[PDB]
Structure formats: structure tokens, C-alpha cells
């Protein structure tokens, strides 16, 4: 992914302020709530029957921190997302059997969570820069079908 030095700075700035304990679990939680079919891949998590059970589930919160960390890794290596998500694209494609459309779904849910967390500070130019980042992450994770 290519980003302007002004977009690179706007992205790093807001990302430095991210609540590492909540944003990831919220993005994963909202993925499972908004797209209920995604709950099939997370059966080992137990109770995911209501939004309250999903958002308060410690496995969603802990795995969401892992997901957020993979996004952070992506942002630290924008110039090589393909290489960065090599083994991660393997695990999702060849072993978890996740339809890549879902990667685009989680990327947009994260953006919704960033909007929700940062409010008016998540401006249209800041959103646009994050759209390039999450599309890049979604695409790099899809790479094993490519």
C-alpha cells in the first residue's frame, strides 16, 4: 500500500492512541454480531448467541487483541503486506477455509470501531487512509487464493 506522508502521519497519530484492549475485541465482536455466519469459525469460544455474550466473551477480546496486532504489523510494513501476512494468509485460506470477502468485512468493521472510538477525529481524509490500509491487509491475507 502507498500512502502520502500526510496520510502516513494521520494514520500513525490516531493508531498510537488506540485502546489495545478494546478496539480489536470490538472489531471481532462486531464482525460476529453484524455478520453472524462468521461465528461458525469461532465455535471454540463458547457463548456467542447474543451481542452481549459476544462483546463480554474473553476469547473474542483476547483473539481481537491478536487481530489488532496483525493489523498493527501490517501498518509497520505497508510496503510489503504480502510478505508480512504470508503464513497468516496460509492459515486462513488453506486451514481455516475463510472466504476472503470476510477479510474485507472485518477491515470495514475495524474502520467503524475507529470511527466509534475517535468520533470527529476520525475525519473523511483519515478514514480514506485507513481504507487503503484495511484493503491492503484484506488483499494481502487473500494472497493464498491469488
Amino acid at each position: 500500500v502507498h500512502l502520502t506522508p500526510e496520510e502516513k502521519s494521520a494514520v500513525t497519530a490516531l493508531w498510537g492512541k488506540v485502546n489495545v484492549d478494546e478496539v480489536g475485541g470490538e472489531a471481532l465482536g462486531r464482525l460476529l454480531v453484524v455478520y453472524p455466519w462468521t461465528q461458525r469459525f469461532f465455535e471454540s469460544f463458547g457463548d456467542l448467541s447474543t451481542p452481549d455474550a459476544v462483546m463480554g466473551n474473553p476469547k473474542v477480546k483476547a483473539h481481537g487483541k491478536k487481530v489488532l496486532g496483525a493489523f498493527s504489523d501490517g501498518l509497520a510494513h505497508l510496503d510489503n503486506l504480502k510478505g508480512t501476512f504470508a503464513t497468516l494468509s496460509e492459515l486462513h485460506c488453506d486451514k481455516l477455509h475463510v472466504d476472503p470477502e470476510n477479510f474485507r468485512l472485518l477491515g470495514n468493521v475495524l474502520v467503524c470501531v475507529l470511527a466509534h472510538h475517535f468520533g470527529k477525529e476520525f475525519t473523511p481524509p483519515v478514514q480514506a487512509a485507513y481504507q487503503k490500509v484495511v484493503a491492503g491487509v484484506a488483499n494481502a491475507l487473500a494472497h493464498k487464493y491469488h
Binding site: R30, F122, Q127
Partner: protein, 141 residues
């Protein structure tokens, strides 16, 4: 397909917009034009600069169309037939654009109405905006 909870959730979330409908509608358009610049091709007749009188006025219509759709949630093919003719027959809008506008509308609601934007409401509005998009991008007359 909207569940009873969804329709209820959408009415309460959208009803909290009220007076600030046009502005959130205008911001969702600006968010779409910035994040997804190909959507701009549908509006060559538009001044798409910041604080645009055309984008502000268009955002009001989009939000009023969504208001009308909320009030006729169980009868959108009849209540939105004119807009379905506009976007499906005349404009032939690729439905991917409806996904991007919907997302931008969700992003706008998430930013300005945090207390209302719960995971359940997010789910319900996404289903609503997907239902509306289907009606506006379908040829059914």
C-alpha cells in the same frame, strides 16, 4: 431480511438523527467521495469540494429517502419505486457503490452518535441499508 428487532433498532437509531439527517447524509457522501474516488464518476455535474452546496443538498435528499424507507420498512419496493427507477433503470449504479455508501453512512453514525451505535444497532442498520440498496439497484417494475 429484517427481523422485528432490526426494524425497531433502525427506527430508534435513525429517529435519533432527526434534524441532523442532512448533515450526516452529506458527510457520508463526502466520506464515500474521499475513500472511494470511483464513486465520484456518478456525479460529474457535482461540485464535490468541501462545504459544497450540492453535496449538502444531496445529503439531505439521501437522508430523507432513508427516513421515508424507515417509515415504510415493510413496503420499500412500493415506497422507493421512483428511486429504484432512478438508480437501477436510469443511473445503472453498480451495487458495490451502495455497499461503500452504506459503510460510509455507518462510519458517520459511528462517529457522531457513539451512544446509539451499539453492535446490535450496527447489525440492524447494515441489514437495513443492504435491504434499501437491493431495492434501489434492482429492476422490478
Amino acid at each position: 431480511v429484517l427481523s422485528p428487532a432490526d426494524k425497531t433498532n433502525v427506527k430508534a437509531a435513525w429517529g435519533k438523527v432527526g434534524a441532523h439527517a442532512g448533515e450526516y447524509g452529506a458527510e457520508a457522501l463526502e466520506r464515500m467521495f474521499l475513500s472511494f474516488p470511483t464513486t465520484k464518476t456518478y456525479f460529474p455535474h457535482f461540485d464535490l469540494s468541501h462545504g459544497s452546496a450540492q453535496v449538502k443538498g444531496h445529503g439531505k435528499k439521501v437522508a430523507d429517502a432513508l427516513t421515508n424507507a424507515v417509515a415504510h420498512v415493510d413496503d420499500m419496493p412500493n415506497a422507493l419505486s421512483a428511486l429504484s427507477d432512478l438508480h437501477a433503470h436510469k443511473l445503472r449504479v453498480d451495487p458495490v457503490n451502495f455497499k461503500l455508501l452504506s459503510h460510509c453512512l455507518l462510519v458517520t453514525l459511528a462517529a457522531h452518535l457513539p451512544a446509539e451505535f451499539t453492535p446490535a444497532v450496527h447489525a440492524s442498520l447494515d441489514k437495513f441499508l443492504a435491504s434499501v440498496s437491493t431495492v434501489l439497484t434492482s429492476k422490478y417494475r
